[PDB]
Amino acid sequence: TVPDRDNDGIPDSLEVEGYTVDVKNKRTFLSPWISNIHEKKGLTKYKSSPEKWSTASDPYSDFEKVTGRIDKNVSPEARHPLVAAYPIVHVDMENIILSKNEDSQTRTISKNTSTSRTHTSEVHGNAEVHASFFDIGGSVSAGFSNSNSSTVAIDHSLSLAGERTWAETMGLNTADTARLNANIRYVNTGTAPIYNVLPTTSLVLGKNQTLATIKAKENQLSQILAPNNYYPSKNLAPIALNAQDSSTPITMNYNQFLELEKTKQLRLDTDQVYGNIATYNFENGRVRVDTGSNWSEVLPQIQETTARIIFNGKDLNLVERRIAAVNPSDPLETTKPDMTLKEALKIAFGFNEPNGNLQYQGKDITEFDFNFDQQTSQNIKNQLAELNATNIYTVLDKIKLNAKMNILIRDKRFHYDRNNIAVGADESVVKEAHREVINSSTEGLLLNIDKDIRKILSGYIVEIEDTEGLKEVINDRYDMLNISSLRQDGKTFIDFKKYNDKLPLYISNPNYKVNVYAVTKENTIINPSENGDTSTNGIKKILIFSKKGYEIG
Amino acid sequence: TVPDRDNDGIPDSLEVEGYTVDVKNKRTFLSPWISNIHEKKGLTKYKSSPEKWSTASDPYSDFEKVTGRIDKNVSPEARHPLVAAYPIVHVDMENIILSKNEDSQTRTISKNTSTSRTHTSEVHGNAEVHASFFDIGGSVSAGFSNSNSSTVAIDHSLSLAGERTWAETMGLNTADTARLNANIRYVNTGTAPIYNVLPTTSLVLGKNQTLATIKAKENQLSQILAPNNYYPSKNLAPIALNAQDSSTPITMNYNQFLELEKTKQLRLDTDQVYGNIATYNFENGRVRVDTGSNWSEVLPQIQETTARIIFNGKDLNLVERRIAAVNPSDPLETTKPDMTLKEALKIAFGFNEPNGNLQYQGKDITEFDFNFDQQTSQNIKNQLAELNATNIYTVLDKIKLNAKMNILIRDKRFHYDRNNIAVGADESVVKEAHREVINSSTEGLLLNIDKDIRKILSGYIVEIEDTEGLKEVINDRYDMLNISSLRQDGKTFIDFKKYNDKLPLYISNPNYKVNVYAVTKENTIINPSENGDTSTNGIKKILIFSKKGYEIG
Ligand SMILES: [Ca+2]
Ligand SMILES: [Ca+2]
Ligand SMILES: [Ca+2]
Ligand SMILES: [Ca+2]
């Protein structure tokens, strides 16, 4: 009569004091922690709640997880009892194509786009918010809350000849209407797979101008949207918007269009209506989809009993993950094991302990900026109070975590915008990343630029300095910055030629200086100034390259 | 064979005499009250009925609640056995847009709106009511009864240039028809979440002119309408009326329109057809939606066995909550624990006992006005009789509560209208709240105005007094009061500039007086007098600011 209140399979004693699953001959034993023999083999000290089926609340029993008798598609780190295993799906727009609503073969602009999961944070301290902002639950979005929003930025450069004025290039006048079309793909950033129904993501423009809502039919798809995997597998045909399937295309009047040309960006607000869930079956050991248990029902619970932490180390992409945090008010939830901001980061993402420090694959914890909400803030400030210390990174392994807590560990190296996106770092860094020259030619530059940094650079600027001090720039236009291409060999490649009429640079005197600059996204522009200054005049460029002419080719 | 008639899980003895749930190691124990050790740890003395599953009648077992093995979305205070845990959803209209039913880019008026849950109370003592008002159950609305009604007020100010006459601004004549459109969002004020089906709320105008009934399709939504949470999360795209989804727009003939322009307000009568309910499952511990148990069935019961109290402390918003009140006639309902108007207020909202007094987060109970219905009135008056006392606030912890009883505890500081809405307080208060000046400029005023009070002020008036006694007002129009904007830093900001042509004030003599007044909603007007007096002449303004010219900038 071994005690098991949750009836999960893991006896209370274990679930509460500690345990781990291990394999003897070929069989697997669920044994209690043994600092002696266990820590050696490499196992893990699993500690869950004895009174809950799945301590996270997600559709997977603490037993099912640790043991491995679960939907193999569930994320690894989510295989751990205190790591919420749910989906997180947003939409990526690879590129778009704009034209005139119905001899139309050269009257169109097809430019690419860059999309990223956004995490819109509150304003400054003087926004005209309605008097309902200071009420309970109402308007108090508290910085960041549950929901999906991806922001697309459209390529401002040039694709054709010497094209100019998006408007005329298409042939648009106050009495015309421009139609939009694009290629997108759903992408699951979460820790659990979606099996059928897809999110009814809507495309917004500006602040509330809903351009269209894509709700690609249900069950039409049987392909799985596994964690870290794009809907139509990156090696397949992306989904196109209002390009087939649909009788009502996309309408965008003049005024609206102008705005698009003004910011050259859109937003993708996606809901959470994911499909039913795939559950295990102890009987035959097959994973099936329970037409009864659908995420929309099981998600809230997770969200109401987990510490959520957003992090961007793996890549400058925001990653969400929830940990099994406790809660004073809820007796049951007070059964969940105690959570430390340290341990959280260890299993929630991957941080580890080398020789005593807490770093994330090299980068030390101290290299990231912690961000919370009003609630979480206090709840922590008050813990630092009763522990006497000002530098949190010290007591990091003593900061208790409670459910409903929201955290945002981000890389300190870069600057971020409203949507907490990487926008560009300090000079000291940008240079430090270009300190590797491979091939110097009058055609371009080949470097071993750091995959990360480069993601914060709009483009480059190439000029030539006279022996006395001149400023002649080859690509002298706001939209002639797009030059750095990326080879699959893992090396960034610049090309002066693309914007010099197929022909290489011009060395008037092999004693001159060939300058190349980088333009961070936060400093780069997308349109001519008030007048019509279409030149790299008023730009905050950066000294990336500066070698003589006899040191190239 | 421990006795459990309700078969809930809590043994009679406990349920009747007292108990509380607590956590030992990581397990949770359901133990009886122990004034000694319990009161210390901070637990609560739970006392429910031994013969009822859920003493409130709501879909949640007394056990499920106290223990926490329930839909995590259920409100906290409703986690207590004697606090009805049901939904309460009304509709908020952020703003509207009026035009002429079909070169229409400058022939429209888009003004914002302010909506609030109303609690329409009876008339005075001379209303022409049909002879059926004094019958049983018939017409005896008894002051306030179950149902949802939200009142919207439309911004009367100006948005464009020097616009005038709503009629002509759109181009309306006896032979034309104006169409309406607006953005709204459902909002759940209750204590329990709705999971799918949404209320068939209808938009009324005046007294019975049903403008349109919005019944946004069922199951189309899977997003949850949690307690204190707006339908499309405040951080999302509000729902628009007859703007897509719909073939029959909104029609409003001349006569009707005029009325709108006359009171500039509408009403939103919403039903209670909420969705099915989310119930817990002891087995695996998952929360699912029982296609069998739908609120429409489970609500009545609550309503017929609970003391309902409306309160507005959290904010000047009416909050409804029901407590497990007893009932003499019903044997079963006579099993419910005894309820005191004190305890009720303690768990129903949050009132507590500091050093012996009963206050609600600072404000003392004595600062609110108690309001009942004919029935509840007597039932209490008769309790004061057999207890010899005239001041109720004394015997507050001795006023028994019976089911079907209706109560309305409201803040005494302000004045209220028909719908029991905050409309404006006494002078002594308005001033007291503006006793904090931060930045004085010839452009505007920055103050630390109390979030609460400000919610009762239509706008401000700015004039200049000569050294002898002149009355020159900058913004001298009924609709030029809208000036106080609110910064997210938590400070109210006034702007003289908005109504002085972008340019700051004019100090003819730095020894003059710069006056600023506030206009309470109850005193403010929305249209020109009989003739055409579009000036702040006949208005009951209030002395808010009065500083010299050399004490500003
Ligand atoms: Ca267990
Ligand atoms: Ca368990
Ligand atoms: Ca019982
Ligand atoms: Ca009971």
From Swiss-Prot, chains A, B:
Changing W53A: No effect on LF-binding ability and as toxic as the wild-type. The record marks D501 as: Essential for binding to cell receptor. Changing I392A: Loss of toxicity due to defective oligomerization. Changing N511A: No effect on toxicity. Residues 103-118 have a biased composition (Polar residues). Changing R27S: Abolished interaction with LF. Ca(2+) 2 binds at D6, D8, E15, S49, K52, D62. It is a multi-pass membrane protein. Residues 414-553 are annotated as: Domain 4, binding to the receptor. Changing Y231C: Loss of capability to undergo conformational changes that lead to pore formation and translocation. Changing F372A: Decrease in toxicity due to defective oligomerization. Residues 100-124 are annotated as: Disordered. Changing N219C: Loss of capability to undergo conformational changes that lead to pore formation and translocation. Changing A389V: In strain: BA1024, V770-NP1-R, Carbosap and Ferrara. Changing L30A: Loss of ability to bind to LF and completely non-toxic. Changing P32S: Does not affect significantly interaction with LF. Changing F133C: Loss of toxicity probably due to loss of capability to translocate LF. Homooligomer; homooligomerizes to form homoheptamers (PA-63(7)) or homooctamers (PA-63(8)). PA-63(7) or PA-63(8) form ring-shaped oligomers that are in a pre-pore conformation, which do not penetrate the host membrane. PA-63(8) displays an enhanced stability, suggesting that this form circulates in the blood to reach and exert toxicity even in distant tissues. Interacts with lethal factor (LF) and edema factor (EF); can bind LF and EF simultaneously and interaction takes place following homooligomerization on the host cell membrane. To pass through this hydrophobic restriction, substrate proteins LF and EF need to be unfolded prior to translocation. The alpha-clamp consists in an amphipathic cleft between two adjacent PA protomers, which assists the unfolding of substrate proteins LF and EF. The alpha-clamp binds non-specifically to alpha-helices of substrate proteins LF and EF. This is Protective antigen PA-63. It comes from Bacillus anthracis. The chain holds residues 203 to 764 of 764 of the full protein.
